[PDB]
Design a protein around this nucleic acid. Structure first.
Lengths: 346, 346, 346, 346, 346
RNA sequence: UUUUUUUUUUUUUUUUU
RNA sequence: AAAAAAAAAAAAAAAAA
């Protein structure tokens, strides 16, 4: 019920299954409630769904730590079992359909129905009975905080999303063990690097090499870590000396530049992905690049990736498995040295 | 509940207080429900109220024969007790607020509360307990199908509105006795004429004089009923010889002209009122008047009204009480005969 | 392309695959095009889909005689192969998804993909290669104007829908052979009666018995056809003596009453179905019923159905296969004669 | 007039009653004006009112220091006399109706009419003649910058709202004397505490003990002010060790935690109230509480309140009058020391 | 095409003339594209134009450094030749019509057509062939990065707008030479000062005098630069002692105040102009002025302007050519010293 | 195959510095 | 010597057709 959902939102912050109703008015893709005689905005519809449907899906969103939407997209998750994963990047549900959540978006009441067999249903092992549901599911992805009997786990990212906040949990557990089944067979998930899902304005280093990068100059950091000949001066630090921006494909370099000279990052595809494309304009020098692909790889991981390459190649498309998906990089070596190594995904 | 109201609408045609819910989607001021997987329109909001509020009020509208909205407006009715009077002319509720109907529009749960004391509340005597409520009400209007002990009745119009259809009931009773209280005192409603609330394209005579008017010509009808000197050729029949349309202030004359030559009626204030103003354009001769006051009086009643006037006055404003309200007519006469007689101020 | 689709609409009335573009402006859920410098309305979106998606689907609607939407609904058709069936009752596409029509609504490019196997795909044998496509389909419905090798046909209704006009074709063939496959097995479609899909204001009899019903009085027609004891006075002709309308469950009776006393038909679920529920208000007597189940069976077929029943049962659920679906009727009889006969559950 | 209101907005920043007009276009709940041939957004309607009505009310808003909307709500104010109080928290007018401001929302021209008698009309003593209007008003609230002859004053909060900015005025007077009349009797307003209406990101201490709280650690501040046994470690400082966040019911503690590690405050009821409920998510540890009641009391005032309670009770509901309204707290104690103290019912 | 424009946006960040289409849905004045099965917002319309037209104009905007919109407005530019100048202040195209850009907004395909002759067409000398187009244009404005044969250049502002960012270019050239033709005659543009187009929260001094103003106190700066008698205590620094704010007509003084005490700036006309008018409310002292004219002149330039005035006049209107337009300053003096100096008509 | 594309360098052209 | 506008080239791919 719309009014029951609004009652739950106003009295508990989200849908908690409580009984009750409040006066609700819907106008201009917005849900209002009457508190002491005046209408108060409860929800503004930023989705393509009907305002009431999107409102009830938002109220019933998962408020526990959940995998980042990019991780679920890379695993081919099409739907979530008895829960709503909210995509805070898009301000919309991460999946078009639901299972036992919303009568308007439900394709089934349980993930065991025939309609859910072709779909990769996301199962949460923290919910009672969902591990057994995944065991019987033809296609699905299961996340657990611990071990599963008879199943080899895949250790995922250290961080997860909690109410739109990507964090490495201390009071709560955000590291999950990932399992996948395709056509009823448990797949072995490849060894992967994981993006750190950090922000430009609140960037915090997570390794000693990152601290050195943030505090040392270009020359000292490159000399200290023996990173000569891999074009770190352009790939990471960026070249703000021409009309077209050069490099800057690591968010750590973007944050380092933003610390001294804040710039603009136009996100023309506002979603959650392993590789993000930005229309970046440098407000200090005027350097701009219409498409700058930025990947939030740990600097140690990127160093290992770029040092694992073969430098004696004119040009090569390099496949790196990041966030459980194959990210293709455009290696551009020349005369035995790297000239450019940027993420080309998205 | 929105879903329960929609369930009642799809299973009973209107809100009947049944339990159950159906999936509902709201978009573009329209209520949809999903029948067999496809969205089906249930309600298009044509009011200034929020779409869900207007949908709930429309579903809970009175489906019994009710007084025409113009009658209630002339009686000063400000609100209805535990019911919704739907104004089908405006496709909106007849009153801004409700009593114990919709949480968003309610000012009280019962008409006995102090908020409803100053307002003139409409009480329906066919609903159990409403006569006693009207007895204790400070201001109110009561309609009953029969007599009320200690209250002298006021016989109202023969016709009443049934689901937007104005009809004289045969299988159902559409004639009510009207009782009004102002400041706790049972008022005496004046003796009034009543408009027939007929349509131009569905006009049906309700008297022998009207039949003769429709079938007999101008001169024959005027001579037969001794209507010389009252300017019936212009006031009722209408003048189409000049670019500015003359007379045509009775719906019977408009019906007679429409029978021979259809014209255009631009209702620039589409509401229910005793006197209606139209932008008439004659498609045959090109005669047009921007404001033409048309009143749907019985032809016998109008003849009696015009014959009860004093003809020895050049200009005189005639006050006629029609539909429980005083309608002002401007009477122009010369040489002891009527020259012009239409509702004044147009 | 939106502009190419609008170009096809303005130059051919619909999408014909022609090349060219016209200026298009979208505002207020409406598509406009610029003709001689002024904006002209091309399409108003009455669906729940985005205006551009609905416009593109409407342009690519099937303009050939197609089965009525109720027939495809009863056959369980979930999607159409490389065509759009437009539901003119709802002014919306008959199916939420498409196959190789609209990138926004397409789930596949061809009906053979794995996503279309669980669905019942509608195939039109008048399009080359669709019969073999149906032969390869796990679930599907095929209509043909002629015979199909190795398949036993099921003769459908004499009428079909042509641009929203339900007609029995003379210049074109509107009678189709129906074939159904469920889980790869050709099904034997049941022997069915077919509704005539006639209108109240444009009702035309299709049999001599219907002619007699329309012209003869109640008693003369009942005595002529030996229809005594089947309560034809109530079920078909209808009863308007009480405030609650009785009977009026056959569209021919509604048409006969409308011929003499026009009344209001409130379609509170405006969609295409074998049984239609109306909020009928008799404008002459005031009799009204909130839910009136009206089925447009041929009068001869309904007479055969009512005479094929066993009269010596108090209450019995009567199952009739109409329009390829089972319609359940309420049969109340007393003293070996019918008292009421209406579609159950209304 | 809409054009005159827009003229006043573009030439003076608000409605000043000047004469003149500017071109105005209304589209998508937005008011535009044409400046040198290009449309400029003047107002976006975030209210449930019509766009032009909300625009006129926003132009005619009070630009003088006015009491905070929570103070007026706690005093029972339903309407303001000849002025508009703008609720900047909701971006909407604080009251549904007006007195002599907007013809669309006016219920009267002057507060002396009968309709305003049952309502608690807000009067401003800084406007000439409103003190006498309050004297003759049945129900009303009067604010003055000085003394009123014969009326005992209630000193209000030091801060007031000035164009949506809450401040303690230096060049302007923001402290008002409050008077209330209920049913014609001048009420004695209770002695109350007042919330400081401070922000999280712009928190500024207003007392020495607040400064000590912000600079000193938990143990030092607790020991210095003899606050052992009042559970200040959880109530104010907050506990972030478990998944469910504990305490953090004073805005000063939230500000202290924000100064070190920023977190997210989801205000699911964005209005002005003495007690605010937030969906709190700690971005550093992962602690989260769906509903966290935060009250912005002076730390000295809160310490006095907590020291005025009786500690020898297991569970007790504490009634504290704050911002002219009774705020209820749960007081849980064990072994003669406080275990929990939060506003009741959250 | 809408789909091609969206494909260009998602693949290159802007319209680059690529071939290809993506699925697009338009709803609620917003453009969405489907990426991996979920709708992603691409553009939200804040213009008065249709959503698709505004989306096409925004995608085809100029992404190279361009003159600020105020400069083009002061030059009388009505339209741009084969390009879209985006007004990021209004989030709308700077000009109503286009030339060979969008079919819905085009008045011509080339600037040589007769319709463009009366209009001042903006030409970009960096685009090939536009200098010759300006040479044959009746009315136009040409900007070049270098010399033009036979034409005397007018050196413009050092800064330009790049993707909505105003900057003095280092990697790009932001200083242009301005040429204007009126009725086919090359005009000599007046010698003018230029506003620095700085922001309050990101103010950076561009001269030694500005540095001294920001660091030194008011008295020290006034004494050092011999600025006694020019009322710099009010005009630049501002007065906050009274309820009405005094002076504060230079953005540098507003920035100095914002550094020590952040306040509110209500931009009630959000557009680009040489003189900006703000509703400034001081959060610390409570001083507010409904309309405050603020001009972003270099402090050295303003000092030269105020020292070039004739002090022996009581009231005098000063005409200053700033940003190629004549800004009217109101000068009040007493006893041979400046009392007040603000742009007139506020 | 075709056409277009890809946040590398390289020439060639061209203006303007 | 640049710079930028306009081409082409080396290379690995991505489509679609």
């Amino acid at each position: 019920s719309l009014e029951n959902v609004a009652f739950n939102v106003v009295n508990k912050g989200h849908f908690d299954g409580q009984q009750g109703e409040v006066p609700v008015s819907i106008i201009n893709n917005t849900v209002y409630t009457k508190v002491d005689g005046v209408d108060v905005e409860l929800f503004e519809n930023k989705t393509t769904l009907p305002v009431n449907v999107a409102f009830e899906l938002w109220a019933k969103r998962n408020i526990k730590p959940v995998p980042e939407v990019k991780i679920l997209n890379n695993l081919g998750v099409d739907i979530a079992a008895n829960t709503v994963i909210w995509d805070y990047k898009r301000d919309a549900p991460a999946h078009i359909s639901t299972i036992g959540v919303c009568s308007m978006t439900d394709i089934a009441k349980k993930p065991t129905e025939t309609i859910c067999a072709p779909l990769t249903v996301f199962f949460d092992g923290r919910v009672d009975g969902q591990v057994d549901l995944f065991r019987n599911a033809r296609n699905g992805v299961l996340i657990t905080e611990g071990s599963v009997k008879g199943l080899q786990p895949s250790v995922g990212p250290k961080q997860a999303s909690l109410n739109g906040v990507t964090l490495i949990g201390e009071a709560v557990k955000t590291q999950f063990n990932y399992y996948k089944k395709v056509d009823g067979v448990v797949q072995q998930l490849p060894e992967t690097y994981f993006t750190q899902s950090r922000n430009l304005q609140e960037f915090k280093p997570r390794s000693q090499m990152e601290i050195d990068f943030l505090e040392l100059a270009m020359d000292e950091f490159i000399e200290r870590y023996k990173l000569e000949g891999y074009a770190f001066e352009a790939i990471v630090y960026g070249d703000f000396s021409h009309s077209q921006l050069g490099g800057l494909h690591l968010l750590i370099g973007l944050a380092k530049r933003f610390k001294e000279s804040p710039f603009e990052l136009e996100d023309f595809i506002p979603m959650d992905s392993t590789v993000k494309n930005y229309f970046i304009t440098d407000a200090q020098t005027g350097s701009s690049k219409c498409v700058c692909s930025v990947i939030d790889l740990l600097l140690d991981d990127f160093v290992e990736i770029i040092k694992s390459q073969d430098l004696s190649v004119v040009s090569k498309v390099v496949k790196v498995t990041i966030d459980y998906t194959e990210i293709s990089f455009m290696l551009w070596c020349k005369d035995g040295h790297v000239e450019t190594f940027y993420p080309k995904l998205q």
